[PDB]
Amino acid sequence: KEGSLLRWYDVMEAERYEYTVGPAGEQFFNGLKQNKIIGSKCSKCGRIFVPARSYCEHCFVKIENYVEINKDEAYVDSYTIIYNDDEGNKLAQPVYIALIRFPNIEGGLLCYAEGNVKVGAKAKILSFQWPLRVKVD
Ligand SMILES: [Zn+2]
């Protein structure tokens, strides 16, 4: 009988380990420890992926180049909202589960969001521990 907050925690945790595998994973999580968002850039098609990845399935080639993503350009792509905690208590501040993206970068980050969240809004990263927490002013 686990509720939606724990379910979402579980999904985000499962993903952490998927992203962790390999040298790109290592760059990504090391980057978070330095308050950076690290992506990788395929040299063949120029796509930039977040979280960083070591292979480009579009080109069928290894990716070797890592790039720092401009964290100030994060935006809310889509989200859902959770109004109550897992015991049924109404939250003072609803919790949002958001896909946060960056312009011209493939992928995104599944994050917790709080504030005046709406689609397209700029997101400021408050915590770089996984899963990330962002706010919308
Ligand atoms: Zn490519």
Numbering used by the authors: 8 to 144
What does the paper say about this structure?
SSO2064 is the first structural representative of PF01796 (DUF35), a large prokaryotic family with a wide phylogenetic distribution. The structure reveals a novel two-domain architecture comprising an N-terminal, rubredoxin-like, zinc ribbon and a C-terminal, oligonucleotide/oligosaccharide-binding (OB) fold domain. Domain architectures, genomic context analysis and functional evidence from certain bacterial representatives of this family suggest that these proteins form a novel fatty-acid-binding component that is involved in the biosynthesis of lipids and polyketide antibiotics and that they possibly function as acyl-CoA-binding proteins. The SSO2064 gene of Sulfolobus solfataricus, a hyperthermoacidophilic crenarchaeon, encodes a protein with a molecular weight of 16.5 kDa (residues 1–144) and a calculated isoelectric point of 6.6.
The final model included residues 8–144 for chain A, residues 10–27 and 29–144 for chain B, two acetate molecules, six sulfate ions, two zinc ions and 201 water molecules in the asymmetric unit (ASU). The two molecules in th ASU are similar, with an overall Cα r.m.s.d. of 1.4 Å over 137 residues. The main differences are localized in the regions between helices H1 and H2, strands β3–β4 and strands β6–β7, which display different conformations. None of these regions are involved in crystal contacts, suggesting possible functional relevance of these conformationally flexible regions. Two N-terminal helices preceding the zinc-ribbon domain complete the structure and are involved in crystal-packing interactions. A search with PISA suggested that the likely quaternary structure of SSO2064 was either a tetramer or a dimer. However, analytical size-exclusion chromatography in combination with static light scattering strongly suggests that a monomer is likely to be the biologically relevant state of the molecule. Some of the most highly conserved residues among homologs (Pro58, Arg60, Ser82 and Thr87) line this groove, suggesting that it might serve as a binding site. We speculate that the N-terminal zinc ribbon contacts the nucleotide moiety of acyl-CoA in a manner similar to that seen in nucleic acid-binding zinc ribbons, while the hydrophobic surface of the OB fold (formed by strand β6 and loop β7–β9) could accommodate the acyl side chain. While several examples of OB-fold domains bind low-molecular-weight compounds, to our knowledge, this family appears to represent the first instance of an OB fold adapted to bind an acyl-CoA moiety.
